[PDB]
Amino acid sequence: LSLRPYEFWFVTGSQHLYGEEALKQVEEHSRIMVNEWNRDSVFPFPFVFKSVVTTPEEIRRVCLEANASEQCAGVVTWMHTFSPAKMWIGGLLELRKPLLHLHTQFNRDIPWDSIDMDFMNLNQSAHGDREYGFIGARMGVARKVVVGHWEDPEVRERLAKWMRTAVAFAESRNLKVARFGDNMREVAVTEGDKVGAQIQFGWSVNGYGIGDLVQYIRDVSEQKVNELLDEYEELYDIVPAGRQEGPVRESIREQARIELGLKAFLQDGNFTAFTTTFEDLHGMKQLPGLAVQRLMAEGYGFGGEGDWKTAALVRLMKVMADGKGTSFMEDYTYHFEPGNELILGAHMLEVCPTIAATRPRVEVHPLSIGGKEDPARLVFDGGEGAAVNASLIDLGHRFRLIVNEVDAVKPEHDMPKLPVARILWKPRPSLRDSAEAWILAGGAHHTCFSFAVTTEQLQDFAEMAGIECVVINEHTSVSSFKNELKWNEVFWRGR
Amino acid sequence: MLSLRPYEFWFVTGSQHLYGEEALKQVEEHSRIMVNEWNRDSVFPFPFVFKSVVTTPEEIRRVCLEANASEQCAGVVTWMHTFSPAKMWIGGLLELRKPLLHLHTQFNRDIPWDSIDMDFMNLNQSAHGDREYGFIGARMGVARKVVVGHWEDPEVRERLAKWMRTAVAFAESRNLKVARFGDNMREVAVTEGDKVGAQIQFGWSVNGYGIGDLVQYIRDVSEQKVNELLDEYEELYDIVPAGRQEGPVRESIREQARIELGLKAFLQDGNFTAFTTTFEDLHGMKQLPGLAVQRLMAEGYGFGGEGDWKTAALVRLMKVMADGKGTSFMEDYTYHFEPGNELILGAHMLEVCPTIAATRPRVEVHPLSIGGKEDPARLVFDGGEGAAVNASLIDLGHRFRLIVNEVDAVKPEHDMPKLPVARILWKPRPSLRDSAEAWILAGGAHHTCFSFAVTTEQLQDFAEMAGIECVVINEHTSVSSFKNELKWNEVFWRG
Amino acid sequence: MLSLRPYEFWFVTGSQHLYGEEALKQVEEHSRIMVNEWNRDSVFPFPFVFKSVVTTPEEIRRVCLEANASEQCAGVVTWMHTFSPAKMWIGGLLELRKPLLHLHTQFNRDIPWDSIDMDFMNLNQSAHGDREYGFIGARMGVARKVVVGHWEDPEVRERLAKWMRTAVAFAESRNLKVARFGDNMREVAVTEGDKVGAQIQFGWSVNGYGIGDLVQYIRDVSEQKVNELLDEYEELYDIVPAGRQEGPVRESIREQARIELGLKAFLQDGNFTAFTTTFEDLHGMKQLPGLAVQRLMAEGYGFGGEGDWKTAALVRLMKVMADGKGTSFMEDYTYHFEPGNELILGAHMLEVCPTIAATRPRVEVHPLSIGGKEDPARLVFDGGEGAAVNASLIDLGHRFRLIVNEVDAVKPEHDMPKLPVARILWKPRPSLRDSAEAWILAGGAHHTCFSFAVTTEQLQDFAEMAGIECVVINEHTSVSSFKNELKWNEVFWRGR
């Protein structure tokens, strides 16, 4: 589910005070920085050099163009010299693309024996970026700030992680969610304000009768179903009974029809996320299962039981992660063994095979929920390692993003009677404390779990979106966490 | 140095009539003893003055009114020797406009175990008297400093002595007059601000004069007094060999002395203690004021370049705090990003105060294109080393913010033969990368006041007196926590 | 004289695909006709442009992005011809930074009783289309003007036409550059303020220049062109006898002419449309600018005395709103408390704009101690009579406030033979006693922009666009109610 071309504009500020020769050297430096940066494979997207800006209208022009350019996912600004910040007011007012303020310098060291006034006039980011820093503070602008020399690999790393965040934000602002049916009845956390979320994030969330999907599934080519099956047998282990013609293989075939119909519906409307609900499956043979797991592996967002917030979150985290190690997730049951406390996570069917440590198996088991026929699904153990588990909730007047850092662990025991894929994790700082903190913050039971997305990225995304992000990790004291929820509540009110 | 009027601190002791006249006599004896002993200690830069024990609403209100009327009263230190019902203090606390310090102390250090009786319990009961007083101060939201401990404790006296300087600085701030020769450097943002608001908040009087007003004073300087001033330059500094004899270079220095004497006459006539100039308005001037300003700063005049009246007032203020020691107008010019040796070179195009010099300053003449006037004479030197603060005061539009970075000034390892300006090298805490990110996030200015003498506590206590936010970047700072505190502070300080 | 770049107004029509392509065709036809006919009605001071009917989020966002980037687009007029599901408008409304007017109209005037059917109901359904759109605007809190009624109603067209003038003033304000020769008059409070906040809020660029910069331009004025300007003074005004032939009085008038040309040269070079002076800084000048200033204002330049950049910008933008008619810098000078005939005399020490003159201006030269310079030449005249507004824009520290008093200028019944400045008399509504008290409670400045042409509706619409409070004092004003509104308003505008 690939992306349109994206690029990041590098805008360098200066002034006319020091003359045209100085301005020539500023351009020279910026053009070199961009070219060298584009040689480093750490960057997942290209920088594009933009002509040095020195006047209010040049600044405003480049910001206007950045706004209109569909490929521009972010603007990186840097003051090479002093660049009087009132000139930047008009541009900053126009800019709606994500902004990163790079506070850097062309040379690494001070040339002690040669440094003169010309050098002082030229390489003065030391103060140019501070005057620019003030107008940003003064206008209350959303920004990432990165400090360091431009060849420092740590700097390039902040830059590169940020590019994925910005590109995720670009995808978020054009994100379309299709809902097949409404929320599970009586459920609170998956409910919320779609107009509010379209205003805040850009998400478009709209509802379709399950019957619209049923028609697409009905029109699937049997030839294509059979080819998809061949692919299933190539990628996965199939339960022995499904490896021969008969009713088990047919159950699998039916998920293949569902996958192909879903995919056709979604491509037709340019949707990149979707929801289903087991309470509305008229005309469907099975709850979508294996089909959904597959579409998630292709980069589609998904939320169960009408959960559009989590479907959008899964999709944008997929973009942040470059499609790696990311899944819709739900906390299912606990292991309270002293010293070995952990969480088993799953869903009734829909867990993405990209978090699998073992080769997935296609299985068919009964599912009473929904009252439909035994669904086919992929079954596997999730892998191990550091990860995040994130929830995005609607508090009524505003949204809150909640991020728990966790450590997935390998199971020490088989779970032979368990018909769904699953993963085990130990949340930080302990199961006891993270669960209390989560509950205090009203975190959902549905989350996006990811081995790839970092907390920095989710925080930066929250900065771009203008919403609160709270983090639960190894350093969390619960009492402090309670205090921060209160202090944050007063800041984010009316904002 | 620009000497101060006599200042003094009033010691007001609270009690009540409940225990009789003999108990009140003993209270007075203790207070008189504390004042007299305190004034024998050279740690205190200003004298304490015993005030008569107060026990009634009218006595309390009277002493507060008198403190407002007294030009020499720089602050009031209040101590409850006994219970002193705080409703009696309401009237006086509403009237009082001098800075207040609540000293929570006790006459005796130790409990006389084998003789302590009800009379002693009645008399030496600060333990609750100061708490009842503590309440009324919290209840009325009064600005105050609180100091706890025995009055012969050196740590207690230290806190008191430091606060005396802060309070004197506040007294100077309330009567501060700034003269601007010319407007802000065009298009610059951080040096702009609300002079009316600043006069309301701090008392600063900031008004503008045409550069021509200064030129007329420079024209009226007597040539005899100029010659004498060159003799002092000769005595005090290393003059460039070229200027040590008659000819162009010496005439370049003689011009700064003319500027110095014209400036001094202007300022003294208007009772100004700080001033600004701008390189964009130098009509009638031969040179940008340079040496002249450097000398004036060393005498204790506040200064801000490019029309910067906030930094000018900050510099005068901090000079008072520092008793004229080790304090300068400053600006971050260029960085040294050598791993394990990151530092900042600070300077200005001419105006850096010699009170921070480690080496004997040299008088030098070099071209300065900025301003388009004749080659100006200036002092050149390396800044000294050691712990320092770098502070800027910005206007956020609806309020002011004091930002303070604790730094470590370092001795240069190499010569800078081509650098025509005085300069200083420092390592900001907790690191270059972190302090600069925090500084930019706080929107701190490029222009600061740098000081080896002023402490963070003093700046904070100043902010408390002036009713503004003060934010500190030091070795303990984490940028993510710093970021939160800005948000939470902004909600408190709003309105 | 100082002329405007071309401006136009985009007409954006909303619909949806629901009813079919033929219906969309009928929608486009209606909108093209509306634009065509509006453009054939001389009440509009600027033309409308037809924009392709928008029906999808992408079409909406595109036109809003284009409006933003178009220098000549001064405003967007939106109308929902049919239901046009408002979530589609979110992306565009977030993007749009040009002034917005929501026109709630309908193509046909009357219900066609004998033939109205479902097709018609589907097509001509602004009645609910504009309500859903109204919702999203309230929901997102956008700045907007709403106008209701049939598109051929002359009252509807009049609201539209007036708003065009306001909106064009706003575009001018957004790009306004002020030059200040010298700083504020020392110790003065109301003319002080926050230039950064003002540039953020209004867009005004405000920067300071040494008087020496102006003096240099004055010295480079061609004596030829001075003489041609002097010729033009003779043509336009009654010059005082002693200034008619060569001599000291005519030399004085000649000096103002030099100031005039240097000032204009400087201003044009930086595209400045407003400026300030200060009598406290006149080094290298022979006179305080007087006659020169009066003439620059007459050309449409904004001016504020004593460093007053807020009034200078206000003067300029109200000139634009007024199309240069009957507008001036102004200051309340002295009162006439005669019972039943209470009035205010307004003037300045020199600088009153001749466009408010009811008599032919006289060029005169009198001494002026203020500033310590040579006797300045200036235009002297009586101001006109009639309905006017007197408006002040102040800085409360944390935000700006616009204060406008509706007044009636009156003709003097007596001469003022000893009075060496131009002046005007007015009777403030609802009374001198009450208007002055309300003004003081609102902290209104002593410097104002006075105008015979600018309406209260336009100042209010400008304030809406700029996101600032506008308070009005007029014939319906009760001081006690007005006092409450200051309180309630300040709670609304705080932190906003």
Ligand SMILES: OC[C@H](O)C(O)[C@@H](O)CO
């Ligand atoms: O551009 C102006 C100067 O050259 C310096 O950058 C410094 O003075 C900034 O205030």
Ligand SMILES: OC[C@H](O)C(O)[C@@H](O)CO
């Ligand atoms: O004994 C009465 C005194 O006033 C004491 O200080 C105490 O009881 C006040 O609470």
Ligand SMILES: OC[C@H](O)C(O)[C@@H](O)CO
């Ligand atoms: O567009 C849908 C319908 O036709 C109508 O507009 C109305 O029912 C909307 O509420």
Ligand SMILES: [Mn+2]
């Ligand atoms: Mn669920």
Ligand SMILES: [Mn+2]
């Ligand atoms: Mn500077």
Ligand SMILES: [Mn+2]
């Ligand atoms: Mn005036």
